[PDB]
């Protein structure tokens, strides 16, 4: 009944003005369910914008 | 001159350059006093006598 | 502060540990670059893209003949590197605490 992973990654940056340190995070959801013959899994590939 | 941090974090928060050794209108509400007699290292010049 | 460019080098067989984030962040000022060995101190900072936990630790750099700072990252303990790394920084420069 549709299924879904959680992945949670993190992300830094730096301001050039006060000296201070931006960790963020993001978690993403994978879809759910791909696969060869019951061998590890599958996933297609390409790019996309947040 | 003095640079204030914080103890968990690290974030910037404020700093100072101060000639009566008062710290006033960084931290809201509060002004700190620091003693003057803070590092100072003293020594005696006997070829000159000070 | 005064100029002081950028742009880092690898030596050849370096070993990674993860991908992630350093910080590096100067403990003492000096402005004498004219050609000599030397030494100062600087302070490291790792972390990590997967789980986001940080280590401090203090570090030594110097220059050599000229706008040079060679580094050691085999003294991040615990975690671990290997290799060098060198900023290009350039004749003329001057080092401000902060920067």
Known sequence: TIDYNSVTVYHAALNVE???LDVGNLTFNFR??????????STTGGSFDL | TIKVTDAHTGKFIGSD???????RGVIQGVDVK??????VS????????? | GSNFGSVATWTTGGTVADSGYLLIEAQENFTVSA????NYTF???FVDAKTGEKSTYEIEGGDDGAGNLVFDLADMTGAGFSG?????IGTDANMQSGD
């Open chain 1, 18 to 20: 006060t000296g201070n």
């Open chain 1, 32 to 41: 759910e369910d791909t696969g060869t013959d019951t061998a590890y899994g």
């Open chain 2, 17 to 23: 350059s101060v000639n009566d050794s008062t710290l």
């Open chain 2, 34 to 39: 620091i003693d003057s007699d803070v590092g």
């Open chain 2, 42 to 50: 003293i020594s005696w010049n006997s070829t000159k006598k000070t």
């Open chain 3, 35 to 38: 050609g000599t060995t030397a």
């Open chain 3, 43 to 45: 302070k490291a900072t």
């Open chain 3, 84 to 88: 060098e790394v060198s900023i290009a």
